[PDB]
Amino acid sequence: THHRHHQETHSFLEPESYIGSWEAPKDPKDAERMLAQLRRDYAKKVSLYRKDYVHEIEMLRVEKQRKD
């Protein structure tokens, strides 16, 4: 709604070390397993993000309810 709230309370983040973190193995089978594990980790991180967003929306709803 205003510049100050956004400029203060925005999480600006560091460089992400996940980018470029792949190390090429010597076996294609192990490489396929490694890529599969990467996909599973991505699914877990997405689920954690979903839970965080559920809690944020719930707290905002409770605040709006008590104000009303």
Residue type, 8: E
**Residues 25/31, Cβ–Cβ less than 8 Å:** yes
| Minimum CB distance to RNA smaller for 51 or for 66 | 51
**Residues 49/42, Cβ–Cβ less than 8 Å:** no
- Binding residue for RNA, selected from 40, 45, 55, 61, defined by CB under 7 A: 40
Query: How many residues bind RNA, per CB under 7 A?
Result: 14
Residue 3 in the binding site for RNA (CB under 7 A)? yes
Residue 51 in the binding site for RNA (CB under 7 A)? yes
Instruction: Give which of 49, 55, 54, 25 is closest to 37, Cα–Cα.
Output: 25
Residues that bind RNA (CB under 7 A): 3-4, 7, 29, 32-33, 35-36, 39-40, 43, 47, 50-51
